[PDB]
Design a protein around this ligand. Structure first.
Ligand SMILES: C[S@@+](CC[C@H](N)C(=O)[O-])C[C@H]1O[C@@H](n2cnc3c(N)ncnc32)[C@H](O)[C@@H]1O
Length: 170
């Protein structure tokens, strides 16, 4: 029912190896979502479509800004999965019609995801910045795009607690 959007913002600033890792994690995110239930990829340029080794016809790919995609589908509020957020994701956020995971890979960390939120709010989108924690700490939480999606799906579909979902995906 809800959209799981992978924001490919930052794409052209990545190396070819990092692009391949992002595309792989998107492919794994699709197969994982295929084992549950609606996967959307914004800023989805032609190079990503060429690197994506999965069924492009089975996912939603939008080449332009995430905000435009959200507005075209009547979504004014989203949940942005952000490890730097101060508030933890909870069941009070599962009524939102779109969850956004940043198409980001590290090579050592940097504060990259909240810039997506600032961009969305600058375009008029209400953004709930939500972090996933294990025992109140982001340490131990896998940050791969597919792993974050798996944690969310285990909480939303299987009713697992966050600690259970994180540890199972850890
Ligand atoms: C490899 S992480 C990127 C980490 C990068 N240092 C940053 O600050 O965005 C890829 C995506 O997974 C999501 N993510 C990773 N860890 C998270 C966490 N602990 N809580 C919520 N979202 C997380 C973020 O949305 C991020 O865009």
């Amino acid at each position: 029912w809800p959209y799981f959007i992978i924001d490919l913002y930052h794409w052209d600033k990545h190396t070819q190896k990092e692009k391949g890792k992002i595309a792989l994690q998107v492919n794994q995110s699709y197969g994982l979502l295929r084992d549950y239930f609606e996967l959307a990829v914004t800023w989805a340029n032609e190079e990503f479509r060429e690197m994506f080794h999965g069924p492009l016809d089975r996912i939603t790919t939008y080449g332009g800004p995430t905000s435009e995609f959200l507005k075209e589908n009547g979504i004014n509020e989203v949940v942005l999965l952000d490890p730097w957020a101060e508030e933890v994701l909870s069941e009070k956020d599962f009524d939102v019609k779109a969850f956004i995971i940043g198409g980001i890979v590290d090579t050592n960390k940097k504060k990259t995801t909240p810039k997506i939120g600032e961009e969305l709010e600058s375009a008029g989108i209400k953004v709930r910045r939500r972090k996933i924690v294990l025992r109140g700490d982001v340490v131990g939480v896998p940050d791969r795009i597919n792993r974050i999606l798996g944690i969310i799906l285990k909480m939303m579909v299987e009713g697992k607690s966050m600690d259970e979902a994180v540890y199972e995906m850890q």
